Amino acid sequence: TQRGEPEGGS
Amino acid sequence: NSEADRQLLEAAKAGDVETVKKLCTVQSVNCRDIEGRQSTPLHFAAGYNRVSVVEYLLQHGADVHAKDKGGLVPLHNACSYGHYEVAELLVKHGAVVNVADLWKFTPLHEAAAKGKYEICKLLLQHGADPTKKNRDGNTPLDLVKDGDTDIQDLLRGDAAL
């Protein structure tokens, strides 16, 4: 599939 | 999955260190989140800048090299969101700075694409290779946004700030 984003936040 | 594992994962995300200390066992410290991208508690604490939970987990045998469903290690999560202190803690405990996920994105790719100069500098000072290409043929320098000229100079080999 497509690459996702890492778990986390600023 | 199990009840105490979900609560440990949620307590790690939330920075709720006391509940982590009460639910964390040898069997659960590296438990994966079935209903997501299979992150471990260390992935959550690292991505959400929960420094006290990160320190606790590493001390109690959390796997600094654990890969989630996409091949990310906790150092990826910290580098993507600019968490310098968490990234420095992971490297101190043996995180491999040149590890690459399933798309061959290294932590330096993450830090360069997100514009985190200090993270880029931290990784380079611990041996990160700026010439590694991901699946799309891009180096970390190729992902740097226009306007982040200090990162472009840093990845070019200029002296760091």
Numbering used by the authors:
A (entry chain C): 946 to 955
B (entry chain A): 489 to 649
Paper's wording?
The ADP-ribosyltransferase tankyrase (with two paralogues, TNKS and TNKS2) plays pivotal roles in diverse cellular processes that encompass signal transduction, including Wnt/β-catenin, Hippo and toll-like receptor (TLR) signalling, mitotic spindle assembly, glucose homeostasis and telomere maintenance, among many other functions. Tankyrase contains five ankyrin repeat clusters (ARCs), a sterile alpha motif (SAM) domain and a C-terminal catalytic ADP-ribosyltransferase (ART) domain with PARylation capability. Tankyrase recruits its effectors (substrates and binders) via a degenerate tankyrase-binding motif (TBM) and exerts its activities by subsequent substrate ADP-ribosylation and/or scaffolding. Tankyrase recognizes two TBMs in MDC1 to support DNA damage repair.
To confirm the underlying molecular mechanism of phospho-regulated binding, we co-crystallized TNKS2 ARC4 with an MDC1 TBM1 peptide phosphorylated at position eight of the motif (943ERDTQRGEPEGGpS*QDQ958) and solved the structure by molecular replacement (see §5). The asymmetric unit consists of two ARC-peptide complexes, which are highly similar. The TBM binds ARC4 in the previously observed binding mode, engaging a well-defined pocket consisting of a cradle that accommodates the arginine residue at position one, a central hydrophobic region that engages proline at position four, and an aromatic channel that sandwiches glycine at position six. The phosphorylated serine residue at position eight establishes a salt bridge with TNKS2 K604. This aligns with our FP binding data showing the importance of K604 for phospho-recognition. There are otherwise no substantial phosphorylation-induced structural rearrangements within either the MDC1 TBM or TNKS2 ARC4. A nearby K602 side chain does not read out the phospho-serine modification in the presence of K604. TBM1 phosphorylation at position eight reproducibly increased ARC4 affinity approximately threefold (Kd = 1.7 ± 0.4 µM). The interaction gain conferred by MDC1 TBM1 position-eight phosphorylation was attenuated by the K604A mutation as both the non-phosphorylated and phosphorylated peptides bound the ARC4 K604A variant with similar affinities, with Kd values of 9.3 ± 6.8 and 7.5 ± 3.5 µM, respectively.
